[PDB]
Design a protein around this motif. Sequence first.
Motif, PDB file in Angstrom:
ATOM      1  N   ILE A   9      49.765 -38.041  21.375  1.00 39.61           N
ATOM      2  CA  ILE A   9      48.408 -38.364  21.901  1.00 39.61           C
ATOM      3  C   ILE A   9      47.409 -38.484  20.747  1.00 39.61           C
ATOM      4  O   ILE A   9      46.579 -39.371  20.722  1.00 39.61           O
ATOM      5  N   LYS A  10      47.483 -37.599  19.791  1.00 32.99           N
ATOM      6  CA  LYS A  10      46.537 -37.665  18.641  1.00 32.99           C
ATOM      7  C   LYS A  10      46.694 -38.998  17.905  1.00 32.99           C
ATOM      8  O   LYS A  10      45.791 -39.459  17.235  1.00 32.99           O
ATOM      9  N   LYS A  11      47.835 -39.621  18.023  1.00 36.63           N
ATOM     10  CA  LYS A  11      48.049 -40.925  17.331  1.00 36.63           C
ATOM     11  C   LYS A  11      47.418 -42.060  18.141  1.00 36.63           C
ATOM     12  O   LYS A  11      46.791 -42.948  17.598  1.00 36.63           O
ATOM     13  N   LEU A  12      47.577 -42.038  19.435  1.00 38.37           N
ATOM     14  CA  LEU A  12      46.985 -43.116  20.279  1.00 38.37           C
ATOM     15  C   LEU A  12      45.462 -42.967  20.332  1.00 38.37           C
ATOM     16  O   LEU A  12      44.750 -43.889  20.677  1.00 38.37           O
ATOM     17  N   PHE A  13      44.959 -41.812  19.992  1.00 38.82           N
ATOM     18  CA  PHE A  13      43.483 -41.604  20.022  1.00 38.82           C
ATOM     19  C   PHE A  13      42.940 -41.461  18.598  1.00 38.82           C
ATOM     20  O   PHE A  13      43.692 -41.404  17.646  1.00 38.82           O
TER      21      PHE A  13
END
Length: 13
Positions: A9-13
């Motif tokens: 998730i930290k990568k997509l955001f």
Amino acid sequence: ILGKIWKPIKKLF
């Protein structure tokens, strides 16, 4: 240290 849903998730955001 978990990040079961933050490792990616930290990568997509």
